[PDB]
Enzyme design. Structure first.
Site, PDB file in Angstrom:
ATOM      1  N   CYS A   1       0.824  -1.220   0.000  1.00 36.21           N
ATOM      2  CA  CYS A   1       0.000   0.000   0.000  1.00 36.21           C
ATOM      3  C   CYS A   1       0.855   1.265   0.000  1.00 36.21           C
ATOM      4  O   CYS A   1       1.942   1.249   0.567  1.00 36.21           O
ATOM      5  CB  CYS A   1      -0.878   0.103   1.241  1.00 36.21           C
ATOM      6  N   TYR A  82       0.118  -2.193   5.734  1.00 38.19           N
ATOM      7  CA  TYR A  82       1.077  -3.226   6.063  1.00 38.19           C
ATOM      8  C   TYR A  82       2.431  -2.697   6.512  1.00 38.19           C
ATOM      9  O   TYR A  82       2.867  -1.605   6.155  1.00 38.19           O
ATOM     10  CB  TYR A  82       1.243  -4.153   4.855  1.00 38.19           C
ATOM     11  N   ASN A 175       5.028   0.958   3.154  1.00 38.64           N
ATOM     12  CA  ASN A 175       5.172  -0.136   4.107  1.00 38.64           C
ATOM     13  C   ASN A 175       6.554  -0.073   4.740  1.00 38.64           C
ATOM     14  O   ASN A 175       7.113   1.026   4.799  1.00 38.64           O
ATOM     15  CB  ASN A 175       4.921  -1.499   3.447  1.00 38.64           C
ATOM     16  N   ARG A 228       8.404   2.535  -3.904  1.00 40.36           N
ATOM     17  CA  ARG A 228       7.078   3.140  -3.918  1.00 40.36           C
ATOM     18  C   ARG A 228       7.046   4.427  -3.129  1.00 40.36           C
ATOM     19  O   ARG A 228       6.409   5.435  -3.515  1.00 40.36           O
ATOM     20  CB  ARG A 228       6.066   2.097  -3.402  1.00 40.36           C
TER      21      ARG A 228
END
Lengths: 332, 332, 332, 332
Positions: A1, A82, A175, A228
Site C-alpha cells: 500500500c 502493512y 510499508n 514506492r
C-alpha cells in the site's frame, strides 16, 4: 500500500491511499454513525462509545466495523497499512493501558479523535495486542498514519522497542521499513528532478537525451515499499499544486498511478498475486470519500454529512465492480 | 508517448497508447467516412479518395482530418508517436514516389489499407516530406506503428538512411531511439520478474525483503522513452491475460498507468510541462474506440460501426474535460 | 572512505580501508612504541601512557601522533572514517568522563586496548570534544570501527543522541549515515548475485543476456557512501575466501578496487576533487601492515614485530610516491 | 573484457584493456620479430611475412603466436575482445579474399599495418572463418579494436550482415552488443557527472547528500558488458588528463579498477568463475608494454625497441604471479 496527503490552493487537506493485497476480503464503504460503539478486542466485550461519525472502506464481518481508512465529521483522516517484518505487538497490556486489536485502531481513533495531538494521547493509553481475527487468521503487521484538517501528518509505528511516533512528517507513507529509514533514504535521490541534464560531449560526439524525462535518472521503477515511497515522495514534490478539491483527487490518483500494481507483475513466495485492489481519497473540510477499483476506473464519491449521523445502523455502499464505460453512441 | 498491443483469450486484438505532450491542440474523436478524401500535402490541392471508414483521436484544424491513432472498418489499427532526433524527412520526393506530409500518414493508411502487408506496400511508394503544418509550425519528428486484425505489429521509422521497417515486433513502441535499439535493450533486463529473490545471509545476519515486489529490482522509474519502453514491455509480459475486450481495455490502461505522467514532474528545458493528455484503446474485431483524459478517469467509448459509414461529413465527438464522478449520495 | 574486515582459511583476521579525501596531509606510516605517551586534548597537557605499540597510517605534525588506522602487538585494529552531517560532539565532558579530541581516539584506543569489549569499556569513560586541530582547522565529523583478533567488528558513532555502538556487525563500514541504516538498506539488494538470470521469451523473441554478470542488475555504481557500502558488502560476501594472509591482502584490494576513485570523477561543491589517496590492509595475527598509494600500485609491507617496541622514538616510514614499475628488459 | 585509449598532455597515445575469462590458458608477454611468418589458417600452410615487430600478451600453443593485444614498432596498438552472440563467421572465404582464423587477426594486423586506415585495407581482403583452435576447441566469438599513434580509434565487428567497421569512435569498447548500441546507450546516462546535486526542501525537510559523489546517481555497478562500457566511458571523460606516459598508465588502471572483477562475484551458468586475469597498457610512441595480474599488483614493463627486432626467435617473458610486496623492514 502507498499513501500521501496534499494541501490544495483553497486550503483543503486531502489524503489518498492504494490497497495492495493478494485477496479481496468482502469490502465496502462503511458510514459509522455517532454512538454505535466499537469493541477493543474480539474476546473482550468492553465497547467504547464513539463520539464522532466517520466514512471509509472497511469490513463488517467481525464484531465492530474494521475500517482500513476514513475521514471524520471533524476532519481527521487516517489509514492502516502493512508493515511486514517490523510490527511487534505485546502479549498482555502494559500497566495502566487497555488492550486493543491492531485492526480496530482506525475505527477507534476516527470515532474519538479530532487532531493529531489527540491521536497521540489516545494511543498512549492503549497496548496493541497480538490478538488474531477470523478474516485473516492472525493479527496483521500494521503501521498507521493520520492527517487532521490542518494538514499536519503523523506516523505511528509499533516497533520492537515500542510505539514509535513521528511528528510533522512529509505526508507520505508506504510499508516497511520504519519512517525514519525512508526519510533518510530520500537524501540519496535529491538529484531526481523534472529538468533535463545538460548535453555533453565525448570527443566529437555530441550527446543528447532521447526525449524528455532524463532528470529522473536514478529513480527505481519496481514495486518494493522503498521504491514506492520514493516515487510517491518525489512526485508529490513536483506535481502541480491542486487548485480545488476535485483537482486534488485527480492529482492524487495521478501520483498513485506510478505505484498502481497490475495483476500478475508481483507474486509472493506462495505464488499469489499482490495487486492494487482499490485507490481512495478523502477531503478533511468536505468529508467526501472517493474511490476507484481495479475493475472500475470511474471515481465514486460518498458524502458523510448527507447521511443521518444519529442512525442506529451502519450505512454501507456496495462496490460497483464493472468498468463504468460511458457510451457516446451505442457501442458493443 | 507509450503504446502496446495485446491479444485476448477471446481472439481479440487491442492496441493502446498514451499521448504525452507540452500543449493540448483542439482534439476530438473523429469518424471519417468512406470516400471522404484525404490530402497528401497541405500545399497540394489534391485529395486521395479513401475506401475505408475509420475512427480515432485527431484534429480538424487543417484541410483534412489528421488522426493520431485509430481503427478502420477492416480492423487495422495504428498511431503516430514522437521520434525526436531520429525522424529524418526530405525536401523533395524520391523519383517514382509521391511526397506525403508526415502528419497525414495515419489518415491515409487507415483509409486505404487492411493488413500490415498493405501498409508496407503502400508506404514504400511515398517520401516523407519536410512540410510544416499550421498547428505546430514545423513537421513533427514521428515514427509509426500498426497492428492488424491478426495481431501482427509493424514499426515504421523514417531514419537518416531511409524508411526502416520492423516486421513482427513484440507489439510495444515508445519514442527514440530506433526500435532495434529498444529491442536489444530488453536483454539487459531479463532478470526483472514477478517473483521474489531467495533470502540470503551475511555472516550471522538474515537478509530478507522489505515486503513484496523485490523481483523487479533493476527496472527504471523515470519517464525517458527508453525507461517507458521497458516498463510497458515487461508489464505486458507479466500482466494476466485479458479474457475479453473490456478486460483488455482495463489491463491496457493498468499497464499504461506506470508510464502515465502527472503535470509537473517532467519539464522541457524551456520550462514547459510534458504530461499525459489522453490514453486511448482500440479493438480490431469490434471497431470500438475507447479513451480517458488527464482530467477524466472514466473511460468513454465510440463505436465505428454504429454510424453511417457513407455519410458525407465527419462525425466528431467532443472531450469531457471534467472528472465524471458518480455520486452514491448527495455529494457536494 | 570504505572499510571491511575478512577472515582467512588459515584462521586470520585482516582489515582494510581506503582514504578518500580532497587533499593530502603530510602522512607516513608511524610506528609508536610502548609508553610513548599520547595527549587527549590539544589545549591540555595531560598525556596517557600507552601500554602497547602499534603501526598504521598517520600524521605527526600536532603534539601526539594521530593514527588514521592500524594494528598493534595484541592484534587490535581499527580506523577513523568520515561521517559528515551526523557526527555530534560535546562542548564539555560528561561528568564522570574526560575530554578527548576526536582525532586521538584511534591512537588512544590502539595503544591501550586488546579487544572490542575493551574498546567499549575504554570509550565509556570519555567524551568526544569539539576541539579543533591545526591540520584541518576544525574537528572532522568521524565514526570509528574496530576488529580484534577473534574477528569481531564494532562500529562506534558519535550520534546526536550520543555515542551509539553496534556490536558484532558485518565488518563493513563506509561514511554516513548511521550503521543501522546501511544494514537495513542491504535487504533491498539481496537479489544481486553472481549467477545469471534465466533466459525468457517475449512473443517469438528469445532474450538472452549480453555476456556474463547479469546477476548484479540493481547494484549502483556511483561513489556515494550508500553505494560504496553495498558494493563492498556484496563483494565481500561473494568473493572467494582467502587461503592465507597474502591472499587475504590481494582479495581485500580487489574488493576495494570497486570503490577506488580516480581523480576528477568526484567533485565537491567547492570544486575540489575527492579521490582515493591510499589503500591499507592489516593482519591481527601477524601484525603486518600493507598499503598502496594513488600513484603507486605496488604494495609496501611494514612489520611491527621486527622493530624495537621499547624505543622512545617514533619509528616512521615514508611514502614512495612513484609508480614502482618492474622493467623486464631495461629502458626508460 | 574492457578497453580504452587515452591521449596525454605529452602528445602520447595509450591503450589499455582488462582480460576477463573463466580460465587462464598458458599466457606470456611475447615479442615477435620482423619477418617471422604468421599463418592465416591453422589447417592451411600459407605463412605471411610480417614487416613489423610487435609486443603484447598472448600464447604460443598453436602454430603462429596468437596475440590478445599489443603494440607494433610503428605505434599501431590493438586488441581482440569477446563478442558473444553477435560474432558471425563464414565457412568459406568470400571470393577475392583469403580465409583467416579469427584468433590470428591481432598478429596479422600488428605485423603488417601502421595506420588505422591500413587496418581497414588489410581486413578488406580477408574473410574471417569458422576454424577452431586447440586451446578452446572452437572459434571464439570476437570483435576488435585498434588505435594508431595519432590516437584515432576504430572498432571492427564481424556481424551477421557482414564486417561492420566503426571509424573515429570514442576509444572505448567492451563486449556485446555492437558498438553503435553502446554509443547510443551513452545518451541515456548524460546526467552522470562529477558535480553534486543542489539541496532541496520537501516541506520543512532540508534534503542534502550523505557525502560526496551524488552526481553519479544512476550509474550501474554490475559487470555486464553494457555497464562496464558506461563506467569506462564516463570515468574516461572526467578523470584528469594524463601529463606523461607514467600518469597515462596509472590513470588507465584506475579507470579499469571500476570494471575489475574479483573472483567469485560473477559466475557463468556452468558454475565457472569469471574474473580479471590481467590488465595491460601500451604506449604507441615509446612502444612500452605494461601489465599487472590478478595475483600481482605491481606493474611490469617490457620495451619493444630494447631487443633485436631482427632476431630469428620469439622473445618471451613469463608472468610472475606472486604478490610482489616491497618489504620495508624485513617483514614476515
Amino acid at each position: 500500500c502507498s499513501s500521501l496527503s496534499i494541501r490544495t490552493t483553497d486550503d483543503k487537506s486531502l489524503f489518498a491511499r492504494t490497497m495492495d493485497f493478494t485477496m479481496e476480503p468482502d469490502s465496502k464503504v462503511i458510514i459509522v454513525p455517532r454512538n454505535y460503539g466499537i469493541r477493543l478486542l474480539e474476546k473482550e466485550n468492553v465497547v467504547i462509545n464513539n463520539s464522532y461519525a466517520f466514512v471509509g472502506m472497511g469490513s463488517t464481518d467481525i464484531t465492530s466495523p474494521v475500517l482500513y481508512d476514513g475521514v471524520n465529521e471533524k476532519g481527521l483522516m487516517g489509514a492502516m497499512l502493512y508493515y511486514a517484518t517490523f510490527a511487534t505487538y505485546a502479549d498482555e497490556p502494559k500497566k495502566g493501558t487497555t488492550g486493543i486489536n491492531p485492526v480496530y485502531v482506525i475505527s477507534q481513533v476516527l470515532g474519538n479523535c479530532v487532531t493529531v495531538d489527540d491521536v497521540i494521547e489516545k494511543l498512549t493509553s492503549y497496548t496493541l495486542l497480538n490478538e488474531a481475527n477470523i478474516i485473516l487468521g492472525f493479527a496483521p503487521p500494521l503501521h498507521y498514519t493520520f492527517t487532521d484538517a490542518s494538514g499536519e501528518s503523523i506516523v505511528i509505528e509499533p516497533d520492537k522497542t515500542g510505539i514509535t511516533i513521528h511528528r510533522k512528517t512529509i505526508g507520505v507513507m508506504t510499508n516497511s521499513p520504519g519512517y525514519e529509514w525512508h526519510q533518510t533514504n530520500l537524501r540519496a535521490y535529491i538529484g531526481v528532478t523534472p529538468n533535463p541534464p545538460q548535453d555533453i560531449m565525448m570527443g566529437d560526439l555530441d550527446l543528447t537525451p532521447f526525449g524528455q524525462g532524463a532528470g529522473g535518472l536514478g529513480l527505481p521503477g519496481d514495486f518494493t515499499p522503498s521504491a514506492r515511497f520514493l516515487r510517491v515522495a518525489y512526485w508529490k514534490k513536483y506535481t502541480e499544486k491542486a487548485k480545488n478539491e476535485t483537482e486534488g483527487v485527480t492529482n492524487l490518483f495521478h501520483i498513485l498511478s506510478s505505484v498502481n500494481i497490475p495483476k500478475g507483475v508481483v507474486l509472493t513466495n506462495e505464488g499469489k498475486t499482490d495487486y492494487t485492489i482499490y485507490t481512495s481519497a478523502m477531503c478533511a473540510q468536505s468529508k467526501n470519500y472517493y474511490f476507484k477499483l481495479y475493475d472500475n476506473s470511474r471515481i465514486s464519491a460518498v458524502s458523510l454529512m448527507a447521511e443521518n449521523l444519529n442512525s442506529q445502523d451502519l450505512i454501507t455502499f456496495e462496490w460497483d465492480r464493472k468498468q463504468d464505460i460511458k457510451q457516446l453512441n451505442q457501442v458493443n
